[PDB]
């Protein structure tokens, strides 16, 4: 399975998708995903 976890350490709203991918990798997570109204970010990796 791939787990989606709210991006811990991301600076506010997901205006930059690129920086959410980084914050997720920074966290030890595969990629990052911007959720709902984009104004909150998630991280995705295998679990």
Swiss-Prot record:
Record organism: Hordeum vulgare
Organismal lineage: Eukaryota, Viridiplantae, Streptophyta, Embryophyta, Tracheophyta
Biological processes annotated in GO: defense response to fungus; killing of cells of another organism
Family: Belongs to the DEFL family.
Family annotation (InterPro entries): Defensin_plant, Scorpion_toxin-like, Scorpion_toxin-like_sf
Keyword presence, Transmembrane helix: no
S-S bridge residues: 3-47, 14-34, 20-41, 24-43
Protein's name in the database: Defensin-like protein 1
Keywords for the protein's UniProt record, in alphabetical order: Antimicrobial, Disulfide bond, Fungicide, Plant defense
Role played: Inhibits protein translation in cell-free systems.
One Pfam entry name: Gamma-thionin
